[PDB]
Design a protein around this nucleic acid. Structure first.
Lengths: 78, 80, 97, 105, 80, 92
DNA sequence: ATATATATATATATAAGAATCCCGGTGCCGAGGCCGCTCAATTGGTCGTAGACAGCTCTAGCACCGCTTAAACGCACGTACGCGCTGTCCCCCGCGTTTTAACCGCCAAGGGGATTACTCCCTAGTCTCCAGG
DNA sequence: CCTGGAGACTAGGGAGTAATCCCCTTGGCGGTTAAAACGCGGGGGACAGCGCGTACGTGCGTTTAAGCGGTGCTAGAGCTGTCTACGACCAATTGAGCGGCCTCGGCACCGGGATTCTTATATATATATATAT
């Protein structure tokens, strides 16, 4: 249940992204925690779909085309 | 200050171990950072919208929950 | 004796078509299809505005909730166009009021 | 004296939009600028949809708009396809495309 | 009468051509029938559920619209 | 090959229902009598169900073709449809 | 090794079978314009609760430095993994044939969205008795 | 010796019982016709396997910043009161859209000439092979 992403570089990245929209945005630690949990739970399913595509492509090493197929079937690309 | 390289290579490798991947190619990490960039450009912008409609500059976790349930990502945890 | 007074958005969007393409007609079943489209977007963004009013714990929906619904749900230029015309829609609503 | 659609100059019924908003169980009080905002936004969106449909009809040399024109108008536009992702257009299909590996050599 | 054989494999092949498929195997039709029977026992049961609280045995297309929007399938067509 | 390629370009520009409406109506009535018998139906409901099923099948066949291309093939197999339904979340 | 002659294989026209459009004439049915009118929009006073604003407060967010230790990067060798490729065979495509079920058409009957003759139950106005102040 | 509380009779309002307006479906009956099942040939693509580059896996040396923790500063989220102002609602008016009926032209349909398409094949040419001094 541990988080493999460190909290402080992730918070720096979140504040870097949020500075593009609105300057001087105060952030809760719980907001960064929820963003990290949601992003990690999303990317774990992404890696599972990537592994399923690589197995379907008869490989054990993942490739960018696996992610390209997985996000296209998932419809995450506009 | 760019912090997309703060998501280090053993962190993504350990997440792929959690994701159930035996061997990870060297160029998976760039597309992983790009997809995480797209996701965090969407959700953080939605949270900024939820915060500015609430007349605040302090971004709260409940706005993050609002942004996640707007996109269909239902979460059970902090915020409520 | 008629059956009932079924109200629709036929003539308004027909006038919209006639001020966009005056020489182009439309089949009626495509017209009802996009009437379903218009009512679906109405039920989407009205529920979005109701949810945003619930988030502010407000029992009154202003135009600001509609602004938030437009800038949340509509992607790209269709957001910022619809905001830009939506403010000036208010001003001409409040000019001769 | 003046209807609100004529007063605001919009082609959409402000009274019918407000009447649906009051009975829509959204709020106990509904403002006056919000139906004008909703009518203007939907009017411009419908104008964009009819404009792209008329362009698709002129590409097909028809002066009567069919749902194939709407199918070729919504899905070709990036923001329309992005917004209407799960939308299925009746009497339509897909954009005609051929995969590269399925092409003849 | 079992009408699952009414979906003929020329029609499935025509759907594959509309779906853009070069070569169609002979056992595609069985899983195609299995997919469409699931799709027609979800939406049809939801439409019967929508009709049941309307206290009718006459199935209207608005119940089908409600069933389709219940499952997220947005159809702009029959029923309004 | 080329004769099979000829109808590939033909049905991509046609919006007519490939499924015959009478076997589809029979199948809808056969399914609906299993839930609750003696159900009256409108024709527009059957047409909406037929066009929704045909569009869903066209999209699923597009994902099947994408999976077959991803596996470096031009011939489709049911595991392509299984992977498409699993990534789509339609797999129970 | 080289001159002479032959024959097999390969690339490009190419001409004939094969599918596609489109201009030319025809109809037909679905857009698209006028009356009747209805119902929902408009206008007007009132009031009453939603909301904006002034002020406090306090509470969590922000910053920054010691320290230390798990975490990250980089070189090194390899070994298992992605990838070309060569048979193969078998399963799916191209086309002729039956047949069989879809399509069209009608009718008589029945359920049913909504409406209506009728009818009993609930509610309030009125009449007279007696009991009190 | 005189008016008001109270039981009984009766007019009015209203929703349930059942029939109806007619409308939509609907199984059933009969003719038609074109799409599917089937089969024969064949051909080309999925698949097995074998070798070949090669690229992350791991491990140790080197670096490094994440995080704990303590301290200080402070920006605004939220609570309390206070005015206020705009929609909710009720009543009268009034015209815009919906339905129905005519009508007319936009597009469906046939069809032969022009247009590609394709595809095996005719033909020009590159090259392997045979012979001899």
């Amino acid at each position: 249940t541990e988080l493999l992403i460190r909290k402080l570089p992730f918070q720096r990245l979140v504040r870097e992204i949020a500075q593009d929209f609105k300057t001087d945005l105060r952030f809760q630690s719980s907001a960064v925690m929820a963003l990290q949990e949601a992003s990690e739970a999303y990317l774990v399913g992404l890696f599972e779909d990537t592994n399923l595509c690589a197995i379907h492509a008869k490989r054990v090493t993942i490739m960018p085309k696996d992610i390209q197929l997985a996000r296209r079937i998932r419809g995450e690309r506009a | 200050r760019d912090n997309i390289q703060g998501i280090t290579k053993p962190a993504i490798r350990r997440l792929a171990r959690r994701g159930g991947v035996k061997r990870i190619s060297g160029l998976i990490y760039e597309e992983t950072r790009g997809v995480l960039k797209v996701f965090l450009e969407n959700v953080i912008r939605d949270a900024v919208t939820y915060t500015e409609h609430a007349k605040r500059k302090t971004v709260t976790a409940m706005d993050v929950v609002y942004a996640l349930k707007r996109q269909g990502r239902t979460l059970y945890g902090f915020g409520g | 004796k008629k059956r009932k007074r079924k109200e629709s958005y036929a003539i308004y969007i027909y006038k919209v078509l006639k001020q966009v393409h005056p020489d182009t007609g439309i089949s009626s079943k495509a017209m009802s299809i996009m009437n379903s489209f218009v009512n679906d977007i109405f039920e989407r963004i009205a529920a979005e505005a109701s949810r945003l009013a619930h988030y502010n714990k407000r029992s009154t929906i202003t135009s600001r909730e509609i602004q938030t619904a437009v800038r949340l749900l509509l992607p790209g230029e269709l957001a910022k166009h619809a905001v830009s015309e939506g403010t000036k829609a208010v001003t001409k609503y409040t000019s001769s009021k | 004296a003046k209807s609100r659609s004529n007063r605001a100059g919009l082609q959409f019924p402000v009274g019918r939009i407000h009447r649906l908003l009051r009975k829509g169980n959204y709020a106990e009080r509904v403002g006056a600028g919000a139906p004008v905002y909703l009518a203007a936004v939907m009017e411009y969106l419908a104008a964009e949809v009819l404009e792209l449909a008329g362009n698709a009809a002129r590409d097909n040399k028809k002066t009567r708009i069919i749902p194939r024109h709407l199918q070729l108008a919504i899905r070709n536009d990036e923001e329309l396809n992005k917004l209407l992702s799960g939308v299925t257009i009746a009497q339509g299909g897909v954009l005609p495309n051929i995969q590269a590996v399925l092409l003849p050599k």
